[PDB]
Amino acid sequence: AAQDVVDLDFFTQEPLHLVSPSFLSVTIDANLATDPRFLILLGSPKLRTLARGLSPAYLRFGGTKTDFLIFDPKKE
Amino acid sequence: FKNSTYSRSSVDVLYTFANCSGLDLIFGLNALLRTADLQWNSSNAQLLLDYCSSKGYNISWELGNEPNSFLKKADIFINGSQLGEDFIQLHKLLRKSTFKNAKLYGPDVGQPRRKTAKMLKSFLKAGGEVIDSVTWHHYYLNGRTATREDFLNPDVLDIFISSVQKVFQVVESTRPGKKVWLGETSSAYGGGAPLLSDTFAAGFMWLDKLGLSARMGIEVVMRQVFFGAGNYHLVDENFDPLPDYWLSLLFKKLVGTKVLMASVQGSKRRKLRVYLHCTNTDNPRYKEGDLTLYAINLHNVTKYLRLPYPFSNKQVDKYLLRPLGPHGLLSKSVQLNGLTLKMVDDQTLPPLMEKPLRPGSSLGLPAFSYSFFVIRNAKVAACI
């Protein structure tokens, strides 16, 4: 119907902002590091194919557990 | 939350995943390791930096997650000024290491509430000089209470605009020109909303967030999460991609770094949301000057978009995303122009195939759907 047709205005004179090529980036929650399957999961060739699809991107390892994790150079 | 340790092996797993995937790892350091005088004790971090140094790991750093809730989380209150001084300490460590030109981001504060500005403002005053970007977090909903209607509600989407304006108010007052990042963001806190955060319905909030972020000057948007326990994961527990994964892939294929602007004529227009960038011209189908429009329709009927002069007779490629049935918006499967999106195999993503429209046609956008449209031969000089 006529009421379902909508007109667009465009601004094209100049870039209003320049985002990073990595604009769409992703996280792993710091809590995944407490999962016993952590090594198995991030080892997944399938998971790596999917992650490579989002390249370029930042991967941020963090979350609430950031402030409750301690590096042990001796364990594991 | 209680303390846990992690191993060299843990760091190796995470670094290898990032490196083999072509992603840039940012690692959050523990900011609740404190001295008697409640300075940041840096000695654990020095252990980690030495190990990463020794392995030639190219890594970037954060310090703390959501400092304004440290009193709730741990009965330790750290004001913004002290956190600034801690970032200065971390900066000096990084500069005395093989990570001397490694990046530093912070302070990963939550979205603006009655008095969260005070911490970000006193933090940027104190430590703003040593951070490469300001990171903050945004969620729209509580995963426990979020409804299907909330996920489709233009009033929910719009609240994000005020969060962004309030963040930029603090940053412009203290570190004008500093890059602003969403360091952690998704649909719903508490791990996401079951059957909503992992479905086609999640795509409204995800694409609108990307649109508004780019339009308002956010440089980087970090999606909680790529993979993990939360319903807001882009990839599920079987390593299968959910609709937001395919959305994210299609965004990266079509959308360039140069942000432009689209708007709809009419008094109120909250349910038809439109965003405009230069086309990503890495794709050999497209050339310099091409435009990528993306649009969300939250009306319950098809809407038809008319391109303004002088683009009304251009050839347009449609990239329309709709759920694969029978679960409609609650589907975990998505079709691009009526073809279901699936991995060809564990090593192989499918092509993302355009549907060419006849030149001079209005852009059809069905009820509760989102679409990219590439305007070919647009010859926009701003896109070089």
Ligand SMILES: O=C(O)[C@@H]1[C@@H](O)[C@H](O)[C@@H](O)c2nc(CCc3cccc(Oc4ccccc4)c3)cn21
């Ligand atoms: O809860 C989560 O899923 C994640 C958690 O996995 C991550 O490890 C952790 O870093 C985190 N922070 C937030 C944001 C918490 C927050 C703070 C302030 C306001 C928020 O959202 C609203 C509050 C009130 C009304 C509407 C939104 C959410 C969410 N999350």
Ligand SMILES: *[C@@H]1O[C@H](CO)[C@@H](O)[C@H](O)[C@H]1NC(C)=O
């Ligand atoms: C902030 O915290 C520091 C360190 O705990 C304290 O010594 C200082 O007085 C506080 N400063 C302000 C400005 O409140």
Ligand SMILES: *[C@@H]1O[C@H](CO)[C@@H](O)[C@H](O)[C@H]1NC(C)=O
């Ligand atoms: C759209 O919404 C209205 C309720 O406002 C309803 O009466 C109408 O039938 C709906 N149309 C469709 C096609 O579902």
